[PDB]
Design an enzyme around this catalytic site. Structure first.
Site: not given
Ligand SMILES: [Mn+2]
Ligand SMILES: [Mn+2]
Lengths: 19, 293
Positions: B58, B60, B86, B89-90, B118-119, B167, B215, B242
């Site tokens: 990741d 991110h 990923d 985001d973040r 997944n992002h 991932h 999750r 992930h």
């Molecule tokens: Mn992830």
């Molecule tokens: Mn992630």
């Protein structure tokens, strides 16, 4: 023909490079 | 596409104080989202790859840690690279992150490969900061173009018929590799099924078979699940991301699986390190770890 996945730590060499 | 200029401006902030941005022209980015999208749809959805290469987890949006990665492992095509989703985001700099990757992808389409996370999905990066980053710095329609580009990402890869890279992890619906190849692009991520579990599932030390994932999405799996999957498909290792890990790497089920995370100080709320699995041509894997002070 088909290679195998061998770890450096497993095969006698350091696993981790620090920075 | 004036590519070498874009990549040049993206690496111009290397060595500067972190936090300084790179703002490309709205059209330039939309070109990346089209030229890369075509390359994705040409290459297989299940990438057949050959070592040697480097695998990173990741990112991110943490763009200066990503620059530290390339500054460490070598700027492409000095090394080959596989990334495990990923990207956005973040972090504060998702746009600088995803663009530099998509540019390298177009630049060296046979020595640089990006896998879906997944992002990389509208409903997710709408929530966690890539949507607010597109609306602020540019507009909405550019985000929709990004989405149309993300839909056509490849899902998984296999490094020399032995390492399996996705991932998230395994799915109970996955019995043969042809189920992956038959998936069409463009595509959204359905809330359930194979494609969902590949980007959301997690390895569980406590359960052996399958279990409910905390999750609220996908499943957990145990050390028994990893032993059967590697045996049936004649595989030695499963590589995934992930989930944050302390050392950046973390083995599972007697080194049958490894979790990679290439973002040190994950969103400023962890003491974690970033790692990166260097695999030589002989499928010998040693890690390179980033770490703050
Ligand atoms: Mn992830
Ligand atoms: Mn992630």
């Amino acid at each position: 023909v088909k290679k195998r996945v061998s770890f450096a730590d497993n095969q006698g060499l350091a696993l981790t490079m620090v920075k | 596409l004036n590519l070498d200029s874009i990549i040049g401006r993206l690496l111009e902030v290397q060595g500067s104080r972190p936090g300084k941005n790179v703002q490309l022209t709205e059209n330039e980015i939309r070109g990346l989202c089209l030229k890369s999208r075509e390359i994705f749809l040409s290459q297989p959805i299940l990438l057949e790859l050959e070592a040697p290469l480097k695998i990173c987890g990741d990112i991110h949006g943490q763009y200066y840690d990503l620059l530290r990665l390339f500054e460490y492992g070598g700027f492409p095509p000095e090394s080959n690279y596989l990334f495990l989703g990923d990207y956005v985001d973040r972090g504060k700099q998702s746009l600088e992150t995803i663009c530099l990757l998509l540019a390298y992808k177009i630049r060296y389409p046979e020595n640089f490969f990006l896998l879906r996370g997944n992002h990389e999905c509208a409903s997710i990066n709408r929530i966690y900061g890539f949507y607010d980053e597109c609306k602020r710095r540019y507009n909405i329609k550019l985000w929709k173009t990004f989405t149309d580009c993300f839909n056509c990402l490849p899902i998984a890869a296999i490094v020399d018929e032995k390492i399996f890279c996705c991932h998230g992890g395994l799915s109970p619906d996955l019995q043969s590799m042809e189920q992956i190849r038959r998936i069409m692009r463009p595509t959204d991520v359905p809330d359930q099924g194979l494609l969902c579990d590949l980007l959301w599932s997690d390895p569980d030390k406590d359960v052996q078979g399958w279990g409910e994932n905390d999750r609220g999405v996908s499943f957990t799996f145990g050390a028994e699940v990893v032993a059967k999957f590697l045996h049936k498909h004649d595989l030695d290792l499963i590589c995934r991301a992930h989930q944050v890990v302390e050392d950046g790497y973390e083995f599972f089920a007697k080194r049958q699986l490894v979790t990679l995370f290439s973002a040190p100080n994950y969103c400023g709320e962890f003491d974690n390190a970033g790692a990166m699995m260097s695999v030589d041509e002989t499928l010998m894997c040693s890690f390179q770890i980033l770490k703050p002070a």
